[PDB]
């Protein structure tokens, strides 16, 4: 996260860190959607141009963390993966359309003050909240500058109008993505970075006070987008795939 601020303790209890086992390295953010399911970006697990093709046994997750370095005794939890599911129509060569993956934990994680699932969006939430100008929130331990944070970082970012999204890049965008970020004009320039990829873009419903995961942080390299908005996988549009994987 660039130009964010320190998260408060328990502010993002669905935040998950994805690690490579050996050599040990932070790969991507992710999110807790139940006691044994984690949502992330497909490109976090499968990206052939960089010889990336992780299996379940290559990876681990850490849940309930606040500090990047410090071990948080009796608070943070580690889990192995039973199975990885990548969207069968994930397009890694062109535009990263359907950049979404699910990971099933080997054992269910115990919920706590620091570990709690985020809601999947329903139709009403998707229809009313996913509008240009409306702000969502990204959290992560990704890079800090165009270097690394001590505690979880948070930034709030406005959804960008679709024609602006299309004009911000040369690759063919689809309806399965949306873009968020501040205008190249004055104001702020908070953003998600590499490392924050795979993590949740969340919005709070004023109707019922709940947090909904509307997006998944898609591709990023460093903290430089050349002033362009970042892209997010549209979770609601891919909700039936998620349900098919989790149920039956």
């Amino acid at each position: 996260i660039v130009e964010g601020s320190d998260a408060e303790i328990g502010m993002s209890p669905w935040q998950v860190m994805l690690f490579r086992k050996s050599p040990q390295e932070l790969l991507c953010g992710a999110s807790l959607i139940s006691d044994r399911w984690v949502l992330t970006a497909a490109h976090c697990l499968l990206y052939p141009p960089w010889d990336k093709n992780f299996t379940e046994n290559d990876l681990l997750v850490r849940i309930g963390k606040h500090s990047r370095t410090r071990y948080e005794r009796n608070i943070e939890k580690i889990s192995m993966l039973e199975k990885i599911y990548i969207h069968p129509r994930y397009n890694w060569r062109e535009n990263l359309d359907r950049d979404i993956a699910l990971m099933k934990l080997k054992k269910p994680v115990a919920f706590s003050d620091y570990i709690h699932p985020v809601c999947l969006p329903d139709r009403e939430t998707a229809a009313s909240l996913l509008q240009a100008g409306y702000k969502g929130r990204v959290t992560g331990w990704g890079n800090l500058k165009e270097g690394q944070p001590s505690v979880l970082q948070v930034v709030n970012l406005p959804i960008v109008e679709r024609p602006v999204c299309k004009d911000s890049t040369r690759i063919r965008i689809t309806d399965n993505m949306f873009c968020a970020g501040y205008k190249p004009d004055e104001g702020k320039r908070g953003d998600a970075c590499e490392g924050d990829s795979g993590g949740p873009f969340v919005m709070k419903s004023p109707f019922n006070n709940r947090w909904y995961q509307m997006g998944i942080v898609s591709w990023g390299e460093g903290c430089d987008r050349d002033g362009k908005p970042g892209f997010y996988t549209h979770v609601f549009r891919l909700k039936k795939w998620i349900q098919k994987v989790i149920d039956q």
């Binding site: 328990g10 003050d113 100008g133 969502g136």
Partner: peptide, 27 residues
């Protein structure tokens, strides 16, 4: 039943430092 309600915030009737920014944006 319980998703998206944080134990240390919504469940305690406490608000985080920047959630106002999100809710005020919803025009």
């Amino acid at each position: 039943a319980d998703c998206g309600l944080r134990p240390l915030f919504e469940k305690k009737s406490l608000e985080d430092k920047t959630e106002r920014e999100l809710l005020e944006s919803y025009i």
